[PDB]
Design a protein around this motif. Sequence first.
Motif, PDB file in Angstrom:
ATOM      1  N   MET A  55       0.818  -1.212   0.000  1.00  0.00           N
ATOM      2  CA  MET A  55       0.000   0.000   0.000  1.00  0.00           C
ATOM      3  C   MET A  55       0.863   1.280   0.000  1.00  0.00           C
ATOM      4  O   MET A  55       0.550   2.230  -0.700  1.00  0.00           O
ATOM      5  N   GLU A  56       1.943   1.287   0.769  1.00  0.00           N
ATOM      6  CA  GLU A  56       2.765   2.503   0.879  1.00  0.00           C
ATOM      7  C   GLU A  56       3.466   2.823  -0.453  1.00  0.00           C
ATOM      8  O   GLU A  56       3.603   3.981  -0.839  1.00  0.00           O
ATOM      9  N   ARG A  57       3.911   1.799  -1.161  1.00  0.00           N
ATOM     10  CA  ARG A  57       4.460   2.059  -2.499  1.00  0.00           C
ATOM     11  C   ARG A  57       3.371   2.651  -3.391  1.00  0.00           C
ATOM     12  O   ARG A  57       3.631   3.548  -4.203  1.00  0.00           O
ATOM     13  N   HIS A  58       2.138   2.182  -3.205  1.00  0.00           N
ATOM     14  CA  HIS A  58       1.034   2.689  -4.011  1.00  0.00           C
ATOM     15  C   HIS A  58       0.723   4.138  -3.670  1.00  0.00           C
ATOM     16  O   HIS A  58       0.385   4.930  -4.558  1.00  0.00           O
ATOM     17  N   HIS A  59       0.758   4.460  -2.381  1.00  0.00           N
ATOM     18  CA  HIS A  59       0.477   5.830  -1.934  1.00  0.00           C
ATOM     19  C   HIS A  59       1.484   6.753  -2.582  1.00  0.00           C
ATOM     20  O   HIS A  59       1.124   7.788  -3.099  1.00  0.00           O
ATOM     21  N   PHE A  60       2.750   6.356  -2.539  1.00  0.00           N
ATOM     22  CA  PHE A  60       3.807   7.169  -3.131  1.00  0.00           C
ATOM     23  C   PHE A  60       3.637   7.301  -4.650  1.00  0.00           C
ATOM     24  O   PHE A  60       3.759   8.404  -5.192  1.00  0.00           O
ATOM     25  N   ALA A  61       3.329   6.202  -5.339  1.00  0.00           N
ATOM     26  CA  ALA A  61       3.111   6.266  -6.784  1.00  0.00           C
ATOM     27  C   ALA A  61       1.926   7.159  -7.147  1.00  0.00           C
ATOM     28  O   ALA A  61       1.927   7.794  -8.193  1.00  0.00           O
ATOM     29  N   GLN A  62       0.909   7.193  -6.284  1.00  0.00           N
ATOM     30  CA  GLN A  62      -0.257   8.042  -6.506  1.00  0.00           C
ATOM     31  C   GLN A  62       0.122   9.532  -6.373  1.00  0.00           C
ATOM     32  O   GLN A  62      -0.387  10.375  -7.099  1.00  0.00           O
ATOM     33  N   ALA A  63       1.004   9.843  -5.428  1.00  0.00           N
ATOM     34  CA  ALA A  63       1.451  11.215  -5.228  1.00  0.00           C
ATOM     35  C   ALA A  63       2.184  11.681  -6.485  1.00  0.00           C
ATOM     36  O   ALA A  63       1.965  12.793  -6.978  1.00  0.00           O
ATOM     37  N   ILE A  64       3.023  10.796  -7.018  1.00  0.00           N
ATOM     38  CA  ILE A  64       3.776  11.107  -8.235  1.00  0.00           C
ATOM     39  C   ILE A  64       2.848  11.247  -9.437  1.00  0.00           C
ATOM     40  O   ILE A  64       3.048  12.133 -10.289  1.00  0.00           O
ATOM     41  N   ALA A  65       1.844  10.375  -9.515  1.00  0.00           N
ATOM     42  CA  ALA A  65       0.835  10.467 -10.571  1.00  0.00           C
ATOM     43  C   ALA A  65       0.124  11.818 -10.524  1.00  0.00           C
ATOM     44  O   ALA A  65      -0.267  12.366 -11.553  1.00  0.00           O
ATOM     45  N   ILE A  66      -0.059  12.345  -9.323  1.00  0.00           N
ATOM     46  CA  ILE A  66      -0.720  13.632  -9.187  1.00  0.00           C
ATOM     47  C   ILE A  66       0.210  14.747  -9.653  1.00  0.00           C
ATOM     48  O   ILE A  66      -0.204  15.618 -10.412  1.00  0.00           O
ATOM     49  N   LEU A  67       1.471  14.692  -9.228  1.00  0.00           N
ATOM     50  CA  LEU A  67       2.493  15.624  -9.718  1.00  0.00           C
ATOM     51  C   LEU A  67       2.616  15.565 -11.239  1.00  0.00           C
ATOM     52  O   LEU A  67       2.741  16.600 -11.892  1.00  0.00           O
ATOM     53  N   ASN A  68       2.566  14.359 -11.806  1.00  0.00           N
ATOM     54  CA  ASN A  68       2.697  14.216 -13.258  1.00  0.00           C
ATOM     55  C   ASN A  68       1.428  14.598 -14.034  1.00  0.00           C
ATOM     56  O   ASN A  68       1.426  14.619 -15.269  1.00  0.00           O
ATOM     57  N   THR A  69       0.359  14.925 -13.313  1.00  0.00           N
ATOM     58  CA  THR A  69      -0.848  15.448 -13.944  1.00  0.00           C
ATOM     59  C   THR A  69      -0.644  16.909 -14.334  1.00  0.00           C
ATOM     60  O   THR A  69      -0.173  17.708 -13.517  1.00  0.00           O
ATOM     61  N   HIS A  70      -1.000  17.260 -15.568  1.00  0.00           N
ATOM     62  CA  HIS A  70      -0.719  18.596 -16.089  1.00  0.00           C
ATOM     63  C   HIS A  70      -1.303  19.676 -15.187  1.00  0.00           C
ATOM     64  O   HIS A  70      -2.464  19.605 -14.782  1.00  0.00           O
ATOM     65  N   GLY A  71      -0.479  20.662 -14.863  1.00  0.00           N
ATOM     66  CA  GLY A  71      -0.915  21.774 -14.041  1.00  0.00           C
ATOM     67  C   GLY A  71      -0.923  21.497 -12.549  1.00  0.00           C
ATOM     68  O   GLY A  71      -1.435  22.304 -11.779  1.00  0.00           O
ATOM     69  N   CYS A  72      -0.339  20.372 -12.138  1.00  0.00           N
ATOM     70  CA  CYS A  72      -0.335  19.975 -10.731  1.00  0.00           C
ATOM     71  C   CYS A  72       1.072  19.807 -10.160  1.00  0.00           C
ATOM     72  O   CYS A  72       1.237  19.497  -8.978  1.00  0.00           O
ATOM     73  N   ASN A  73       2.099  19.978 -10.979  1.00  0.00           N
ATOM     74  CA  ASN A  73       3.434  19.743 -10.438  1.00  0.00           C
ATOM     75  C   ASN A  73       3.979  20.973  -9.733  1.00  0.00           C
ATOM     76  O   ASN A  73       4.601  21.839 -10.358  1.00  0.00           O
ATOM     77  N   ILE A  74       3.761  21.014  -8.428  1.00  0.00           N
ATOM     78  CA  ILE A  74       4.150  22.153  -7.606  1.00  0.00           C
ATOM     79  C   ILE A  74       5.659  22.264  -7.479  1.00  0.00           C
ATOM     80  O   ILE A  74       6.159  23.284  -7.004  1.00  0.00           O
ATOM     81  N   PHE A  75       6.381  21.229  -7.918  1.00  0.00           N
ATOM     82  CA  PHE A  75       7.850  21.245  -7.887  1.00  0.00           C
ATOM     83  C   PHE A  75       8.540  21.483  -9.241  1.00  0.00           C
ATOM     84  O   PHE A  75       9.762  21.391  -9.322  1.00  0.00           O
ATOM     85  N   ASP A  76       7.803  21.763 -10.310  1.00  0.00           N
ATOM     86  CA  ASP A  76       8.414  21.571 -11.630  1.00  0.00           C
ATOM     87  C   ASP A  76       9.384  22.686 -12.026  1.00  0.00           C
ATOM     88  O   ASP A  76      10.017  22.610 -13.073  1.00  0.00           O
TER      89      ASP A  76
END
Length: 342
Positions: free
Chosen positions: A151-172
Motif C-alpha cells: 500500500m505505501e508504495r502505491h500511496h507514493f506512486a499516486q502522489a507522483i501520478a498527481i504531480l505528473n498530472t498537467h498543471g499539478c506539479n508544484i515542484f516543476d
Amino acid sequence: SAMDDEYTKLLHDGIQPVAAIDSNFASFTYTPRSLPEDDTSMAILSMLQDMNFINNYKIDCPTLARFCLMVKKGYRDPPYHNWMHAFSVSHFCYLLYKNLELTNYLEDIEIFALFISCMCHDLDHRGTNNSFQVASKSVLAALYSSEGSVMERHHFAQAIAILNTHGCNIFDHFSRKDYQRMLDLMRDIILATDLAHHLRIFKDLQKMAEVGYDRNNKQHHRLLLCLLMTSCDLSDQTKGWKTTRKIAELIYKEFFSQGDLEKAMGNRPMEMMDREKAYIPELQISFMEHIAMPIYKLLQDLFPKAAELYERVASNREHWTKVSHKFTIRGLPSNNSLDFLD
Ligand SMILES: Cc1nc2ccc(C(=O)NCC(C)C)cc2n2c(-c3cc(OC(C)(C)C)ccc3Cl)nnc12
Ligand SMILES: [Mg+2]
Ligand SMILES: [Zn+2]
C-alpha cells in the motif's frame, strides 16, 4: 464540475490567515477533525503559507491549488483512511513545525517534504492492509508485493501520478537536484508509515535518541523524518479521550470490514480484524503500549517540549483501562432481553 468551482474560489478568493481558522489552530490541544471538511483545503493552503513554503519555494498558486484538491480527491472514503485522516496528519506536522522548532534539526526541503508526504501518505487507501492485498491477489500486490510495503508504495506512486498530472506539479520549477531530492524524500517518508519499516528501524531510533541528535549526521536526519512521520500518523492519540474513542470506532469499523471479506474468501482474519473475536479495549491498550507510546517517548527524548504529547497518550491509555469494564454486560441489556443469547 465541482472541483473547478472549488478551485476557482480556492485560487481567486485568497489564502485566509491561520488564526482565522481557529484561535488555537497552532496548539497541541487543537483537534483538526473539528474543522468542517469543506474548509480543509483552504486550511492546507493556510498552513503551507504560514510555514513560508509558498514564498521560499516560489510555489505557483494556481498549481498548488490544483495539487491540494487533487490530493484531497485522491482519497476514498473508508471509515479511517480517508481525507480527514490525511488532513489531521498534515495538521499535526504543522503543529510540530510551530511548536518544536524543526529548523534546528532538519533542512528546509526536508520539512517541506514531510508535510507534503503527510498529505499524500495514504493516497487511494481501500481500507485494507498489505496482507489483504497479497491474499486477494490484488493489482497492487501484482505490482509491489515482491518489494513489500504494497500500500505505501502505491500511496507514493499516486502522489507522483498527481504531480505528473498537467498543471499539478508544484515542484516543476525546482532544480534537477532539488526535484530529485524532494521525490526521494517523499519515497522514504511515505515508506516509513509501514509498521514493518518502523519495527526494523526502532533500535536505530533508540540509539539516536541515546547518543543525542547530530544535525550534521545525514542518517540522523533520515531517522528523524521517519519518527516524525510516524508521530503525525498516530497524532489522533495525542488529543482528548473523545478523539481516541472516535478513532477506535473508525479504525475497527474498517478492520472488521476487512475481516468480513477475508472470511468470505475462506481465510482466517487476524484477531483484531475479526468482529467475533476482537476485544477492543485490550487491542487498543496493546497498540498504545507497543506502538504509540514508544514513538512519543522517542519524540520526547529528542524534543523536551514534546513531553505533553507522550503524557497525553499515556493518559488516554489509562482511560481505556478505566472504561474496559463497560464492555462486560452487567445486569440485563438496556432492552431487558436475553434474546441475544440465542
Ligand atoms: C488507532 C489505531 N489502532 C491500531 C491498532 C493496531 C494496529 C496495527 O497495525 N497493529 C499491528 C498488528 C500486527 C497487530 C495499528 C493501529 N493504528 C494505526 C497504524 C499504525 C501504523 O504503524 C506506524 C507505522 C507506526 C504508523 C501503521 C498504520 C496504522 Cl493504521 N494508526 N492508528 C491505529
Ligand atoms: Mg498508511
Ligand atoms: Zn496514515
